[PDB]
Amino acid sequence: FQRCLDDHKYKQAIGIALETRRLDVFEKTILESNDVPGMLAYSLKLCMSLMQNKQFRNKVLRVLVKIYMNLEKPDFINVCQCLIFLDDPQAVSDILEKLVKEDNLLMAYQICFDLYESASQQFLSSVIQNLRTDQTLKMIKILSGEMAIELHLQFLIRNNNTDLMILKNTKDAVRNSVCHTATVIANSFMHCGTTSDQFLRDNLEWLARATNWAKFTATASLGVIHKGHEKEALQLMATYLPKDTSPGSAYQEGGGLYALGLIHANHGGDIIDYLLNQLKNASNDIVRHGGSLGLGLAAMGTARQDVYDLLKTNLYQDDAVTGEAAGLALGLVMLGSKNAQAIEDMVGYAQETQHEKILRGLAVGIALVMYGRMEEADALIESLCRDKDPILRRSGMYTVAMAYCGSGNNKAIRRLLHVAVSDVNDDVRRAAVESLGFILFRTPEQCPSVVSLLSESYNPHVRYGAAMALGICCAGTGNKEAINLLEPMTNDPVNYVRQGALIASALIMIQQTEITCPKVNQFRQLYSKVINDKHDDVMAKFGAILAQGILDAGGHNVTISLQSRTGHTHMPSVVGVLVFTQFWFWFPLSHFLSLAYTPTCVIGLNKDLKMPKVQYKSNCKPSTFAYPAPLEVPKEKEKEKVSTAVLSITAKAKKKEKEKEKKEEEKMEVDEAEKKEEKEKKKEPEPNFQLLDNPARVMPAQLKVLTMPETCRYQPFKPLSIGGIIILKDTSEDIEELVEP
């Protein structure tokens, strides 16, 4: 190592220093002489990307924050890149109280936004308890995440690019089947978070045609449109109460309660208490669904005891139909908890009951009670796989997915795929090969190489979960190798594996134009083909209409990503996607994918209210992309002719007629002309410097090619190469131009 000191190159030194687990040698190579003090930026990504163990990982991560505190400026990156992994609540609260104490409310204002976007529930609830132990009330709201929601609501109400006619050209092709549910899940997706009501307004008699569970689904879709609508939604569905809609319709009032849960997800308030008091005073059966699904969704990740107690005595009712309702919600309130009583009561209750709906609700629930434990589940992981209950073996496969999310464990991928080949039920073979993407989504290079040969199996159940493994591993990238695999998958003989190929195709290419990847316009007309064909299966075209809703979700402004901004992983985008895969067993679980709709936006709010109108531009390399025009080109074709092929004596007859024009045309008068190259002229001087205001949609590809106006004086604070929210460093004087609709 002294030779590595005599190297003067110290990345050679830092290799051995992390091999032999010694850490004072680690500290000295960064507190060396002045040779690039951003070696910590190399070492952070080195510990971020390729560290398998977690036992000494936090130790190396917290010997980093010793030199970050000993660095000149503490605030910027070290908290939300290290301490949220190291989950120290009061360490964050104290040093941010330090940052307020020197009267520095500009960068503490930044780090609270970055903390709320990245870090999870109950870490923010724990730090905000140690907050209150004004500008303090300013940092209450931006750590409780209040005003981040309304600006996110402000972005989507300003920007809305949906073609109304696309859903009209699918609506008229719907026969008297139960594709009405497939349409109302489509417009809810592509008006999610928009608060736009026109399809629940104009064709309202058509909406009243489908019944008895579409009424449950359609009024659940109403909560999807009003996602993040905190106070205005409670007075909105103060029209459709659980005692004012209809004394004969419980599906109306049941899905209303589930719609309140879809609005206020990850938001504690009176609505938890309001939904708790209506599970006290409840009707017979199908008020207890959307009550419990809504209540477990609003109390997700809270580990709240009082709601957890009554969901048990809801579960021990042994009612057949609320068993799916209770078991899903019982896991959501204990998500990532690792409780003694929760696993034991739910795996205890999973045998003496005599239905299997009750098993399927508790299937996902006991998989979701543990989340990212990474070694701490293996006694339960082994015990669920050994049992002779096929649903409980299937649930153990979801559990090993959710405990090992984003880790390249060889022990996972060995054990998870050994049962994929060997096991005798086919449903457990799916959830084996559906768990592939949950553990490998962080490195999407491997998932085409490992699922491609399983996509050509002999049974369709392996080929089904092969297709949705591509949909979840490569989440929203332009991978095009997964698209290369899905091309014969959507042309399968079996119907439901065609369905899964359509939905996985819709997941991979959201917000991607033709120049981004060429297979976009191939698949949009392919969706159009199998939705306008009359002799295809309803189940085969169910995925097609749902692929319409995914592909333009939120008016080309939201996206899905299990991966977050700052290297951290989402808890809602993982829970939102896997309970969405339980749409075979229950269609109204399809609303849960709206939890994973993360926005594509940059907002330059510098003060608490001040969002200045700042025009800044991108520098896309030869041309433009991004968020195209709607297509209104139905047809107007004409048969109009059959060409006269008379090659008889006409041939010499027309020739002597052309001689008759050689006396008439060139000897009396002829002059007519037109000008060339006017239409070629305007194309080449084009931009690639497109200025943008700051409600600004931005692709996650073009985050790196956008540039602040250096000719403008107002510069941002954070390095502006990644989308989300930043603050402006407002320099001079005379600030104006605030805008709110």
């Binding site: 008297n176 089947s177 139960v178 549910t181 008895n212 569970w213 689904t217 057949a320 139909v321 005599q354 239905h355 299997e356 709906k357 002779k388 119907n495 439901y496 369905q499 299966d537 309803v538 189940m539 169910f542 749409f583 075979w584 067993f585 229950w586 269609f587 109204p588």
Partner: protein, 287 residues
């Protein structure tokens, strides 16, 4: 408040009573009852099946004997378990499965008395090889003529288990009755006792079949394997550019070069090793 994509659980003990009693009276369309429990809205289970004495009429409402009914139910109350009847079945030998015009009237009688009263149709003489032509059905109303018959809902397990077959939709499918799915209440301690007791051999595992026919069979394969090797000589020394990817495909015959080859080498290997290895063990074990 309407039907879904339901589920029918039949016990393992039921199914053997079904297709033995059907195979017994193969010409004459046997008849029996179906005894289980309506467990919830949209699953149903049946645990037990007993037959019926056959009348001159055949499968109809008159073959249901009410005095044989209550007496058979009575002597199952005190022994085993009492439960409610959940349907009925009959055997259709000459064709797979569909409710006839007399089948549809006796379904009306039971669905008026009971909740749904699932019928079962079993073809014994078609169910032979490794699959069983058994199907279950349920009569649909005509009051929903302006609404969706088969009122199914929020699930994706309707396109499985059968597409509606052409020989069954030519009859009252799908405007008089609907199909319903069948899977089996299959458990351990009945699975293993039927596995291990039907196919087992203990002392046979180290017998000899000794050598007068074993070493004779070692002549029985080698001889044509010699001639088939000479046929293997023929194609390999041929090796002409007759567009050899076309020359290989225009003479597929389940024949010489690899198909009628080492398949024999496998059988010569497996027979002689298992013979000689069991021979060396008996010298080891017995003194």
């Amino acid at each position: 408040a309407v039907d879904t994509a339901e589920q029918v659980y039949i016990s393992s003990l039921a199914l053997l009573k079904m297709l033995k009693h059907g195979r017994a009276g193969v010409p004459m369309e046997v008849m029996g009852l179906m005894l289980g429990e309506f467990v919830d809205d949209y699953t149903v289970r049946v645990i037990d099946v007993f037959a019926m004495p056959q009348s001159g009429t055949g499968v109809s409402v008159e073959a249901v004997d009410p005095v044989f009914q209550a007496k058979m139910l009575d002597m199952l109350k005190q022994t085993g378990r009492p439960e409610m009847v959940v349907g009925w079945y009959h055997s259709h030998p000459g064709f797979g499965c569909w409710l006839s015009g007399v089948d549809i009237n006796t379904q009306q009688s039971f669905e008026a008395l009971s909740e749904r009263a699932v019928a079962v149709v079993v073809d014994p003489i078609q169910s032979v090889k490794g699959k069983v032509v058994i199907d279950a059905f349920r009569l649909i109303n005509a009051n929903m003529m302006v609404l969706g018959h088969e009122p199914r809902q929020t699930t994706s397990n309707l396109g499985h288990l059968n597409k509606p077959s052409i020989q069954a939709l030519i009859h009252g499918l799908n405007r008089h009755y609907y199909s319903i799915t069948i899977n089996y209440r299959k458990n351990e301690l009945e699975q293993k006792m039927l596995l291990n007791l039907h196919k087992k051999s203990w002392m046979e595992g180290l017998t000899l079949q000794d050598y007068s026919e074993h070493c004779k069979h070692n002549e029985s394969v080698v001889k044509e394997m010699l001639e088939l090797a000479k046929n293997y000589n023929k194609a390999v020394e041929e090796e002409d550019k007759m567009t050899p990817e076309q020359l290989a495909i225009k003479n597929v015959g389940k024949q010489d070069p690899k198909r009628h080859l080492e398949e024999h080498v496998d059988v010569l290997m497996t027979s002689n090793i298992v013979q000689c290895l069991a021979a060396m063990l008996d010298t080891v074990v017995f003194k």
